[PDB]
DNA sequence: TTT
């Protein structure tokens, strides 16, 4: 029905008392090619948060934005 | 705290 796998992880950007942590990764969602996710994550990241996924050019153009 |  819908499967996830973090194919790579570039940055943490915060951590809470229960140990979740927001992070930047490049998430593969339905076995689709992996695209860039800002999301929050369990300790050991088998259960998601909320969080937002940006293709590669909208990942770009936010860069590209702010610095 | 699920695309």
């Known amino acids: 029905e819908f499967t996830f796998e973090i194919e790579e992880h570039l940055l943490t950007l915060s951590e809470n008392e229960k140990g ?4 930047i990764n490049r998430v593969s ?6 695209k860039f996710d800002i999301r929050a994550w369990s ?3 088998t ?3 909320k ?3 940006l293709s ?4 770009q153009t936010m860069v590209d934005a702010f610095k």
């Not at 590669?56 to 990942?59: D, P, Q, R, V, Y």
Request: charged residues 25%; hydrophobic residues 30%.
């Open 47 to 49: 259960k998601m948060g």
């Open 43 to 45: 300790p050991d990241h």
């Open 29 to 34: 969602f339905n076995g689709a090619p992996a």
């Open 51 to 53: 969080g937002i996924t």
């Open 56 to 59: 590669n050019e909208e990942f």
């Open 20 to 23: 979740w942590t927001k992070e």
